[PDB]
Amino acid sequence: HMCDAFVGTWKLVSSENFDDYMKEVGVGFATRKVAGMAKPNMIISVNGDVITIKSESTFKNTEISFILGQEFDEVTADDRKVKSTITLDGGVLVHVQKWDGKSTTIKRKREDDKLVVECVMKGVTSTRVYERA
């Protein structure tokens, strides 16, 4: 029943500062424009200890499956090859991506009827808000 409150199908309803976040990550102009337009659906499911997060959009479809605390390979929508670890900290999913000596942290939390995604690259934070589909 870990992560029950995250399970479901979610649709993006707002984004703030995501272009600046992508710039800080190192994403180039064309990918930032196209990625920034997308309105993804996020599909989260749990089967035993395995959590799956899918992102479906006009830009890219991505999928990760993982066990909390257990590092995995992830190819991000912007085609970074990262090493990811996702843990639960006080009810927040905390996702750290490492690549090329860099790091970014993505937090996913339930707040009211929303799922809030906060991503941070050094001093730059972006907030993306999802509602149930």
Ligand SMILES: Cc1ccc2c(c1)c1c(n2Cc2ccccc2)[C@H](CC(=O)O)CCC1
């Ligand atoms: C650098 C970079 C590029 C693409 C990126 C990200 C970082 C991050 C996301 N996406 C997917 C995405 C997929 C489609 C469109 C935009 C973004 C997720 C956004 C989310 O799930 O809303 C999680 C936070 C960090």
